Design a protein around this ligand. Sequence first.
Ligand SMILES: CC(C)S[C@@H]1O[C@H](CO)[C@H](O)[C@H](O)[C@H]1O
Ligand SMILES: CC(C)S[C@@H]1O[C@H](CO)[C@H](O)[C@H](O)[C@H]1O
Lengths: 285, 286, 144
Amino acid sequence: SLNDKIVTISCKADTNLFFYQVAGNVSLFQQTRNYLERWRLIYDSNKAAYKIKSMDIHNTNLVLTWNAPTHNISTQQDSNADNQYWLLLKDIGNNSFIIASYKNPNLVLYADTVARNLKLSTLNNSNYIKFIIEDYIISDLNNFTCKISPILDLNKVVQQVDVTNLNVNLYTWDYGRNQKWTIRYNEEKAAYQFFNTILSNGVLTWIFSNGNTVRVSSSNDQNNDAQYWLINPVSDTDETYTITNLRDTTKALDLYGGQTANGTAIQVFNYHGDDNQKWNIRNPP
Amino acid sequence: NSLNDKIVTISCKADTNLFFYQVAGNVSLFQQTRNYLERWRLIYDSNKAAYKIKSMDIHNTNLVLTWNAPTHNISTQQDSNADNQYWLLLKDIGNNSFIIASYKNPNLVLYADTVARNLKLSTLNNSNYIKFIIEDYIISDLNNFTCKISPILDLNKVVQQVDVTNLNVNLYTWDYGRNQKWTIRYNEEKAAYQFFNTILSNGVLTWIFSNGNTVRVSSSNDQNNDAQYWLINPVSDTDETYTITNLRDTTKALDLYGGQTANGTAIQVFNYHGDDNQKWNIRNPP
Amino acid sequence: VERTFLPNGNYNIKSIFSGSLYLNPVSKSLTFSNESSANNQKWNVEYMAENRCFKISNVAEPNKYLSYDNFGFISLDSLSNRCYWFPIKIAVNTYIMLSLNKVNELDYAWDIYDTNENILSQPLLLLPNFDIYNSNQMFKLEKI
Ligand SMILES: CC(C)S[C@@H]1O[C@H](CO)[C@H](O)[C@H](O)[C@H]1O
Ligand SMILES: CC(C)S[C@@H]1O[C@H](CO)[C@H](O)[C@H](O)[C@H]1O
C-alpha cells in the first residue's frame, strides 16, 4: 500500500528532526524540504518488509542498512540483504510507526536525538522508537508559509486585498502579510487549507454560491469542501503545482484569462492544465 | 481512536480458520462461530496509547485479554485496567495483519500455537504465528457467508433469482434451491459487498438503475458498476437483521414491494425509510 | 576450589546453532564469529559466593565484563550489578544464562536470534525467559 511512495521520516520524540542522508551517513537533522530527507519505500511482498532507499541525486543506489551486529545505522549499496529490510508497523491511535529490522525483528530503530543519529533498541513504550512517515509533498507543504506565484508572472503573487476587503487578486510582490499563505493539511479530509497571514482564521475558499469567485472567509464552520484544496506536483519541476478544489476537483485555481496585470482576478475554472492554472509555491525571500 | 469501541474478530494469519475464542476465563483458538464467543471490544486508553481487548461474553461481562506474568500464558480476567491488560496494536502495513504487543512489556507479543490451539507470549520473529487479522465482526461474519435472505414480514419466504436464465429477483417460499441462496463477498477497495446467487458463477444482486427501482442479477464481468455493490447495516438488538443500501446511491434500500408477502412480490430498491419492508434477516440455510 | 557446577577459569562461548562460531566483541556489540584463536574469544568465568552468581570478563580486556545496556543488548562494561549472571545448566556444557536481577519483573536471559539456524552477524540480546526449552537462549561454555 506504501510501495514506491517517496516519504520523509521524522521523530515522534522531536518532530523537527528528519532522517537525513549524505554519502552513506545517516543522521537526524532539521527540515530541508529536499532530496536529502526523502526516501522511497520499496515493498518486498514475500518478506512483507520494505527497503528504504535514499533519493540522493548523486548516488541513486543507497538504502537504510543495519550494520549488524553493531548499534550503527547507515546507508549502503542495495544488495537486497536482510539487514536492508524493515517492517513498517503502524501504531494505531498514535498515528506513528515502529520500524523493525527484518534481520532481527526484536530490534527497532531508536532516535538518539542528542547524538542526532539512529540506533537500535528492543521494543518499549518510549517515543524514541516512534516515527512519523509522511508523503514528502505533505511533509514540505504542511505548516509552510509561502507566496503563490503564477507560472506566467513570477514577480507577482496571489493576494488578499486587505484585512477588511476579503477579495483575492494578483499583485506585484511587496512582502506584505496579505501576500503570504500558511498551508495546513487536514488529515481527516485529505486536503489542504490556505490561511492568509493578515488574518487569524481566513482561508482561501471557492464561493460556490457565486459562480467562479474565490475569496477568503472564516474557517470556523465545521464542515466544508470549498475551503479545501488539493495540491498536485507538475512532473519535472521542484516547486510547481496545480491547485484543485475539494468540492469539485475539476475546478482548478485560475488566473483570469492569463492576464498578468495588477488586479487581475483569481478564480476556480475548469481544469485544462494550461499555464494560467500552474502555480509556483515558494519560500518568501 | 479509529479502533476505539469497535467490535472485532481476531483470527490467525498462520491459520485463517482459527479465531480468538473466550469462555469462562479461558482463551483458545477455535473455528469460526459467528457469535459472541469470538467477539471482542477494542477499548482505547489515549494516555497509554494502547488497547484493552474485552470479551463480549454474555455471562461474565467484565473480562479482558490478560497476560499471566511472569508466565507466558494468556487468559481472560476481570478488568482492573492493569498494564498486563493493555496491548499495542501494531499494523503491519502491506501485510494487512497486526502484531499485538503487551503494553506491560513490549518485548513480548501474542503468539498463536495452532497445535495446542491457544495463545502465548513470545519474542518477535518473521513468522505468521505472531500476526493476526483484526476485522469488524459484521464483515468477518458475512464475508464468504452463503445465506438465505428473508423479509422480516415473512421469515418463511426468501429473496430468489427466478431461475438460471430468468434473472428477475422476487419473493418466494423457501424450497432449498440454489437460486434461493446467495454468497456474500466483501470488497475491501470499495468497502461494500456483493451478493452472488449460487445458481450461477458470476451473477450478482444489482440495482438496474437504467430502469427505475428494478433490481435483478447481472454478471460481475462488468468492471466498475457501483450498482452491484451494497452496504449491509445491522439493526440493533438483533443478531440477523439488516438494512441493505446501494453503493451507487446509499439513499436506496433493498425493499419488498408494498410490504406484500405473496409469492412473486417484487424485490426492488426504494428511498430509505427503515420500515419493516426494508429489513432483512440474513441467515444460515438450514 | 569449586563451590558450584561450573569451575572458575577461561572458556569459549558458543551458541548451540554452531560449533564453529565463538563469542567476541565487535565494536560495542557481542557476536559469534569465526575461530580466531585470540584472547577476545576467551572468557574468564568467576564465581561470586556472596550472591551465588558468576562474573564473565574478556581476557583481552580483563576489566570489562559481560553486562547489558538500556537497549536490550549484551555489552562489555565496567563492573556493576548488571555483570552478575545466573546460569541454568541443562546439559553437559549447555546453559541458559539469566541476569541475576529480575528485569521488568521477569527472568531475562542471553538470546541470539537465528534465521533457519544461521546466527551470523547477530548481536547477543537480553530477552525474557520463561522455561529451559528456548533454543535461542542455549549456550555452550567450553573449557579452553
Ligand atoms: C481569453 C480567454 C478566453 S482565456 C481563458 O479565460 C478563461 C476565463 O474564465 C479561463 O481563465 C481560461 O483558463 C483561459 O484560457
Ligand atoms: C401501499 C404502498 C404505498 S407501501 C410502499 O410501497 C412502495 C412500493 O414501491 C415501497 O415498497 C415503500 O417502501 C412502501 O412503503
